[PDB]
Specification:
Region (Interaction with Z-DNA): 8-76
Domain Z-binding: 8-74
Number of domains: 1
Distance between the termini: 42 Å
Number of helices: 4
Shape: globular
Strand order of the largest sheet: 1-3-2
Organism: Homo sapiens (Human)
Function: Catalyzes the hydrolytic deamination of adenosine to inosine in double-stranded RNA (dsRNA) referred to as A-to-I RNA editing.
Protein name: Double-stranded RNA-specific adenosine deaminase
CATH topology: Arc Repressor Mutant, subunit A
Length: 76
Amino acid sequence: LSSHFQELSIYQDQEQRILKFLEELGEGKATTAHDLSGKLGTPKKEINRVLYSLAKKGKLQKEAGTPPLWKIAVSD
C-alpha cells in the first residue's frame, strides 16, 4: 500500500527507458508502442502510459497511423 503514494517518480524511470530508446532511433523511423515494449521489455500497457506522458510532456512526437509510431520531437 505504500508503493501507491510513491508513484509519480515510478513512471519517470519508465520514461527514461523509452526516452533514451526513442533518442537512439533517430528523427524519422518512429517506433510504435508495440516496438517500445520489445526494444525495452516493458509491457505495452506500461509503454502507452509512459508514451503518453512523454507526448504530453512535449518531448515525444507521435506519428498518426496504425499503430501510431513515436519519435523524439526535435524541438530546436
